[PDB]
Every structure is written in C-alpha cells, then in structure tokens.
Design brief:
part of a larger assembly; 4 chains; A mainly alpha (about 55); B alpha+beta (about 290); C alpha/beta (about 350); D alpha+beta (about 230); C: about 350 residues; alpha/beta; 5-stranded parallel beta sheet; 3-stranded antiparallel beta sheet; 11 helices; D: about 230 residues; alpha+beta; 8 helices; binds magnesium ion; ribosome
C-alpha cells in the first residue's frame, strides 16, 4: 500500500482551514498535536549487527 | 356540593341561577354520582357551559341540525368568508413547522453553507461570502436499462477563495441540472485544499505532471504576465488565486481530467522554497526580490 | 459489650412474628364463633372511667393514623433475610452470608501472594507511562508480531528480528512510541476533547468501557458503522447531546434543535485493531481527526497519526497498552479539574 | 466555566447507543452482585416474568435501530437479576428492574375466587357448537337430572352419556356429587359435551388441586369448532 500522507498532516491541513477562515474554532487536539509532532519518515533502516549473537 | 345563592350569584349569570336552584332542590345533597363506562356524555375537559365558544360551539344564527331559530330568523347573510375561524392563535401549524409565507428567496450558496456546517462544521459565512463557484463541465449522461435509457445530469464545478484555497466537486442528478450543480458545489467545498503559491501569484518553478491520459506542462511566469493556459486551467487558476501562468496540455484534453490533473499538480508537484531549504539545509534566495530590498 | 441492644430488637422481632401468626389464626375462625360471644360479654359488661379512656383514645388513634392519614407521599444490607429459629439449622441464605463472613476474615490467612499476574489488574490498575519498562511490555506479549509469511514490509523499521517463525517487534521503539501516544491522550483529555476508543475484537469491551469511563470518553466495541464521521447527520443526529461545564457536570440547559443536529466529531480516535477498521481510519483522515492505533507487523503504519508498534492479537497486550493510554487520559482529566478548583 | 456540547451517552458512536447504555447499566449490577446466589424456586418454575414488550422497549432502546437479538439480550440480563434470591436481593437491583416491568400493574385483576353458594352448589356454564349448558353440582350420591328428566330419557346415545361422566371419572368422583344440568340449543352432541365442559369447570371449586388433572384430560378446554360458512 502507498505511504499515506493525509493521516500525519492533519495539523497542516487543519491550519489551512483556520487561516483561511473555513474553520472558525481551533480544535481541542490542535495545540496538543502541534507540541508533539508525528513521525513522518516511514523509511527502511539498515542494521549492522544481530542482537542475539 | 350545594352552594348558597349568594356564592353562585357572583360567578354564574342571572339567567342560569334559576336552573341551578331547581337542580339543587331536585338532586339530594347525598347523591352518590357514578361514572359511566359505556357512553361519554360530557367532554374530556371541565366546562361550566356558561359561555358560547366562537369555534367549539355552533355559530349563533347559522343553520344546522340543532339550530333553535325559526327558518326565517337566521342572521347569516354573507357567505364569502369562513364562518368559524380556527380558535386561539388562528393556525394549526405543527410544532417545528414554519408557515410557507415566502417562497423562492433561498440562495443555493446559503443552502450549501447551512448543510455543510451541520455535517462538517465549516463556517457558513466563509462559504457564502468568500467563495466563488464556477461550473467547468455540464453534460448529460445516460444508462441503458431494461426499462429504457435513464438520463442523468453531470456537473463538475470548481470553488475557491482566490487566496490559495481551491476545491473541485462533482454532482449527479436524474431530475435537473440545477440539482447536479448544487451537489457539485456541495462536494467542491468539502474538497477545498490549500495550494502553494509563489508570491501569491504563480507556481514554484515548472510542472510536468501526468494525470491519466493528460500531460500537463505548466510554467511559472513573471508578474503581469497573465494566464495563458487551457481554458479549463484558466478557471481553476482564477478561483485559486493564480494570476501568472503559462502551460500546454498534450495527449488527452478531456476537460474533466484536465481539471482534476491541475488540482493534483498544484499540490503533489510543487515544493515551497521553505520546504526545499529545510530539507537540504540550505538558504534559497530570490534574487529578484533581494534586488529591490533595502 | 453492646450485644443487648441487638437482643432487645430481636426480642421484639420474635414477638411481632407471634402476634402476626395468631392474627392469621383468627382470620380463619368463623365470625359466628367469636362475634356473638364477644358482643354478649359487652352486653354483660359495664364500661369504667378507665375503660372509656381507651374507648376514645383508640378511636382517635385509629382515626388519625389509619383513616385520616396520607397513604403515600408526593442492618441495611440484606434487609430481606428471614433469619431461622435459634434451634433450627442455618438456612441456605444464612449459610451464604456465613461463608461471606469467613471469606473476608479467615479465607486469606496463612500467606500473601507476590509477583503473580492477575488479568483484571491490567484494566483497573494500569501503570503510569513513565514507569513502563521493556520487561513489562515483554511480559504482556507486546513484542510478538505476525508470521513472517504475513509480513507487510512497510513495518521493517519496527522489527527487532524473527524468532520461531514470527517477527519480534522492537520494544525500545514501542516504549518511545507508547510514551508519545500517551502524552497525546493526556493533552487532549486535559484540553476537554472527545476521545473515542474503537475496538471490535472479541473480549475488548471491558477494557474499552473502563478506558472511556476513567477519561470521560466514549467507546465502540460492536461495529463501526461506515459513515459515522463522514455521514454523521444520517447516523448520529437522532442521538442526544448535552452541555457540560468545565467540571464535566451537566449544565441542564435545554439545547436548541440547531445545536442537537450539528455533527459532534471526536477530537482523538484510538483504534485497537486497525487492520479490521480501515473504514474508521479513512473516515478519520477525511475528517482531519488525529488517530492512535496499535500497529502489528502486518499493519500499515502511515494510516494513523501516532502508531504504537505492538501485538494486536492478544487481549493482554491490547489491554496493557489501552490501560496505559487510559490512565494518561485520567491524569489529564484530573489536572484539568484541579486547575478549575484552584 | 467554559461550556461545550458533548454526546450524552458513552455509547454515542455505537449503532444503538440507547440499548448499549441500558445493557451496560445491567451488566454493572450483574458484576457487582456476581456472588449473590440465585433462586432455588426457579426449579419450582415461579410464574413471574412481566417484562415490557419489544415494541415498548423500542421507545427507550433506539426505536427502529432496536434489533430482536438486542431485545433478547436485555431479557437474559433482566431475568438473571430478577432471579436473584429474594432474601439476598438489594434495593439497587430492584430499582433498576422496576423501569422494565409492564405497566399493566397500574390496574388490578378481574378474577374473584369462586366459591360454593348458599346451598353448597357449584354453578358453571359450558358451550359447544350452538349448545349451552348451566349445571348445578353439589355433593351427593351420583344423581343426575337433565332439564328435569332422567339421563337415559334425555340422552339416548350411550356415547353422549359417557361424555357427561368423563370429568367425574377423571377425578374418580362419579358417586360423590349430584348434578342438575340445564341445557338449550344445538343438538344432543353439542348439549352433552357442553354439559361435560360445564361439570369440569364446576368441579374445580370443590378441590382446586385437581384443576391440573382436569386440564390434562382436556375437559376444561372450550371446543372452538363451529359450522363455518363456506368461503
Ligand atoms: Mg495482529
């Protein structure tokens, strides 16, 4: 499945609604999500050692 | 209970006092009244029956089965109005229903704004005042069924605030094209997105985007260049707030797919200078803007 | 020392049963046996000054509390137990209460139990996010991913290794992701947002209901109706809303029909089993609702705002992670109610 | 101080928030009182279970959303709480269960205990086809009169006579009662079986413990069959 973009950018899409005026009132989650950014790299990471042996 | 004439004479009219006196001399005070559970003679509410109600009682002077006047002594000589208007307020408007006094005064934008606010929480004022709607495709489609060909109206519209926010909406209706446009306008507001704009006038650089069979080649332009692009792209740029743009469409020129491709290109194929700078850890300077700076 | 107090009552209780039993005995006797003989005695008796005292004291005492009274108005535990006679053996109900007395005092004599896992305590005594260790996560089975044959390679960065034909989730990352997710729940709870807990796998209801209760949130355990968020007016408009103050107490103000039809969108969606709730996740995206979900090795991480890598098949692992998130919400709620007091 | 609008029920986002909230309230009671023993009279099949109808519960349990299986789940929990031993029950359980009892209890019953009259006679009426019978049963020695006439005179068919005797044969009291039967309408079979039905209904007053045996024999059931106009 394609790496989704719209689930981790809710804050940025919401900020466009608020700046334009399409959304009058800031949502309760808005400040919380801004202070705790989601991880959005979704990369494959190399590994250089077998932790068991 | 039997009451003295004095008390009864302060509440009931003189004409009815004789009847009350005779009833209090024929019905013993120790009468144990019983309730009838077969025939309901009295109304379901309390009433002394001393006043004639203008609606719930027969109209004085009107002919009817129980009229007590002689046939030559009726007092209804005008028949152009309803004799007994409804009681109380004068209406029976169901609770929660409004009298249709005014018709045809609705604004479809206000109808879209009210519905979307209730369904999604968007501000009605922004929709009805800040947004501009432009139909892009309006055609009739048809489905072949056993009964016969069923026609439908298809409408593709674009909405935008001319300040970065633009949306594309589609709508279908078997009844009329106006209903299809209403649905498309409704859909377009729900799909509103922000598009990056360089200096709020153009796009960042050039875009070569493929949307299905449509090849879109869009180039940024100098201030005052104007919109020199396919007519479908022109309308979208107008709503979105793009003023300067050049471009050419190759291969498929299907209006529907040009519009969707353009919206997709403006979002998925652009990168702001700020986003490029942060990703690469470099400073990007607009030479033309610095030349005119302090 | 004070047993007589109860003994005084029991004496009356026994006497009352005796009076009632022989009141029913006289209810069978024909009137012809008692009435005429009783009346004859009075015909052969003469009332005295004292006898007359009760002739009118009882008339009023019976014309005041029996006839001219209001029939209605406009030892508490087990108050319906019928005690058995002191000579008779215990009744079944008394034996049950006699066993309950033993269970409280004696049944737990001899030893205490330490370092033993009790399943219910995961729901009722969840730890705080700061006290969670890799050991605790591992004890709950959170590290046990899916079969390597079912691997969704987009989770590669969460995998610690493969063991016994399954992928082992990296608990060091699970802990960091769990702490971040917990802080989000606490923030939204402290801000007054609506938190919905969604889980539709068998057995999850108990955890879901308690999580909602201690965060003053909401839960769905049976089925997510497709369209709950995108088609909310056709599904949830009929249900009742209410206005509440900063202390979460109902204001009692009647709501205008305009306010009772408006969509009430969750501020945060927690999904226990995202692989079976694609509909809800996509609606959350469309509705710009941040979401938290447990991401197993076969689950797509990018579909949620804050993923928590972990086993989603075990009720212990799910309830352990849900409990931590629920307590984080509780602390946020308690911090919001505390700032209102002071 | 700041006020906000929130869903009333914790189950707001479920398919039927009203039913799930009620089920949760009952489930809490069944968890808080898990230990309380259940009635041992349940084996005795106590005849008490007046729960509201599916349609009545739909007023409070989601209306159209209410599903039959959801109503079945409500009854399984209402009965379980109701079947807790009466001595060991508490107010909380009864308070919750009160709201789910049929409101027919508002009124009273229409049945008054039947008793022998001033002359020791049990009077019952019976009907079969177009026939009717009013019998007077008193303690006696087996004397029977039909419309003032001897049984062999009024009823010529021995099978009709055997039908009249059957209820007395079930309780083995053929020689313990005198019967004065009065019958009108229909024919011999309708009248004989209408008398049979009326004797069975009159015998229950003398010993109400034998009603179950009379019902099992089939003599207390009113035969509904009548001549049907061809349709
Ligand atoms: Mg799994």
């Amino acid at each position: 499945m394609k790496i989704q973009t719209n689930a981790v950018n809710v804050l940025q899409r919401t900020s466009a609604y608020l700046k334009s005026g399409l959304l009058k009132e800031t949502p309760a989650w808005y400040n919380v999500v801004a202070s705790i950014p989601p991880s959005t790299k979704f990369t494959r990471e190399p590994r250089f050692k077998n932790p068991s042996n | 209970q039997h009451y003295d004439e004095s008390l009864l004479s302060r509440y009931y009219p003189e004409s009815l006092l004789k009847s009350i006196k005779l009833a209090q001399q024929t019905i013993p005070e120790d009468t144990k009244f019983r309730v009838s559970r077969n025939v309901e003679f009295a109304p379901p509410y309390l009433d002394d029956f001393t006043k004639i109600h203008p609606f719930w009682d027969y109209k004085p002077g009107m002919p009817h089965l129980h009229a007590q006047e002689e046939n030559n002594n009726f007092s209804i000589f005008r028949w152009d109005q309803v004799q007994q208007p409804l009681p109380g307020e004068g209406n029976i408007l169901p609770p929660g229903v409004s009298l249709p006094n005014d018709g045809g005064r609705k604004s479809k934008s206000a109808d879209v704004a009210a519905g979307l606010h209730k369904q999604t929480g968007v501000d009605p004022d922004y929709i009805t005042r800040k947004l501009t709607m432009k139909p892009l495709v309006m055609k009739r489609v048809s489905n072949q069924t056993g009964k016969g060909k069923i026609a439908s109206f298809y409408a593709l519209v674009v909405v935008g605030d001319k300040n970065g926010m633009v949306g594309l909406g589609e709508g279908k209706s078997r009844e009329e094209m106006s209903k299809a446009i209403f649905k498309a306008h409704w859909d377009a507001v729900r799909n509103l997105k922000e598009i990056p704009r360089y200096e709020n006038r153009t796009i960042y650089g050039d875009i070569d985007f493929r949307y299905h069979g449509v090849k879109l080649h869009l180039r940024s332009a100098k201030p005052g260049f104007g919109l020199r692009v396919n007519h479908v792209i022109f309308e979208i740029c107008e709503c979105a707030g793009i003023k300067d743009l050049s471009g050419k469409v190759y291969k498929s020129r299907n209006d529907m797919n040009i519009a969707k491709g353009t919206i997709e290109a403006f979002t998925k194929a652009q990168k702001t200078l700020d986003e490029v700078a942060l990703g690469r850890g470099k400073k990007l300077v607009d030479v033309r803007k610095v030349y005119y700076s302090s | 020392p004070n047993n007589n107090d109860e003994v005084m009552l029991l004496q009356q209780k026994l006497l009352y049963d005796e009076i009632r039993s022989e009141l029913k005995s006289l209810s069978q006797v024909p009137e012809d046996e008692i009435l005429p003989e009783l009346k004859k005695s009075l015909e052969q008796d003469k009332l005295s000054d004292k006898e007359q005292q009760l002739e009118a004291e009882l008339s009023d005492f019976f014309r005041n509390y029996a006839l001219l009274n209001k029939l209605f108005d406009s030892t508490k535990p087990y108050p319906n137990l019928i005690p058995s006679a002191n000579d008779k053996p215990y009744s079944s109900q008394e034996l049950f209460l006699r066993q309950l007395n033993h269970s409280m005092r004696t049944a737990k004599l001899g030893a205490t139990i330490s370092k033993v896992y009790y399943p219910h305590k995961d729901i009722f005594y969840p730890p705080l996010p700061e006290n969670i260790t890799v050991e605790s996560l591992m004890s709950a089975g959170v590290h046990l991913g899916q079969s390597t044959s079912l691997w969704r390679s987009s989770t590669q960065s969460y995998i610690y290794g493969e063991y016994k034909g399954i992928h082992i989730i990296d608990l060091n990352q699970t802990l960091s992701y769990l702490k971040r997710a917990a802080k989000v729940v606490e923030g939204v709870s402290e801000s007054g947002g609506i938190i919905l807990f969604l889980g539709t796998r068998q057995g999850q209801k108990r955890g879901l209901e308690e999580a909602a209760k201690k965060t003053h949130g909401y839960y769905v355990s049976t089925r997510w109706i497709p369209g709950t968020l995108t088609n909310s007016t056709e599904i949830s408009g009929i249900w009742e809303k209410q206005e509440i103050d900063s202390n979460d107490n109902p204001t009692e103000r009647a709501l205008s029909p305009n306010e009772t039809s408006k969509q009430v969108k969750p501020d945060l969606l927690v999904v226990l089993n995202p692989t079976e709730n694609r509909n809800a996740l996509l609606e959350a995206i469309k509705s710009r609702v941040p979401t938290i979900a447990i991401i197993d090795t076969d689950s797509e991480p990018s579909l949620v705002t804050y993923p928590i890598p972990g086993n989603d098949d075990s009720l212990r692992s799910v309830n352990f992670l849900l409990g931590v998130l629920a307590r984080a919400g509780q602390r946020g709620l308690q911090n919001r109610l505390a700032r209102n007091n002071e | 101080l700041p006020r906000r609008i929130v869903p009333k029920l914790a189950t707001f986002y479920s398919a039927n928030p009203n039913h799930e909230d009620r089920i949760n309230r009952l489930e809490r009671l069944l968890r808080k009182y898990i230990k309380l023993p259940s009635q041992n009279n349940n084996e005795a099949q106590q005849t008490k279970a007046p729960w509201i109808s599916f349609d009545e519960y739909a007023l409070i349990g989601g209306g159209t959303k209410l599903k039959p299986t959801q109503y079945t789940q409500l009854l399984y929990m209402l009965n379980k709480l109701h079947n807790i031993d009466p001595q060991l029950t508490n107010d909380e359980i009864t308070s919750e269960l009160s709201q789910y009892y049929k409101k027919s209890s508002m009124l009273s019953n229409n049945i008054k205990i039947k008793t022998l009259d001033e002359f020791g006679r049990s009077i019952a009426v019976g009907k079969r086809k177009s026939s009717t019978a009013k019998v007077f049963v008193v303690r006696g020695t087996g004397e029977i009169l039909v419309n003032g006439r001897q049984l062999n005179d009024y009823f010529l068919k021995m099978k009709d006579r055997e039908s009249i005797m059957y209820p007395l044969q079930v309780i083995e009291s053929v020689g313990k009662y005198n019967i004065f039967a009065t019958t009108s309408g229909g024919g011999p079979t309708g009248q004989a079986e209408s008398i049979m039905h009326a004797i069975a209904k009159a015998l229950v007053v003398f010993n109400p413990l034998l009603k179950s045996r009379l019902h099992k024999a089939g003599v207390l059931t009113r035969d509904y069959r009548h001549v049907e106009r061809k349709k």
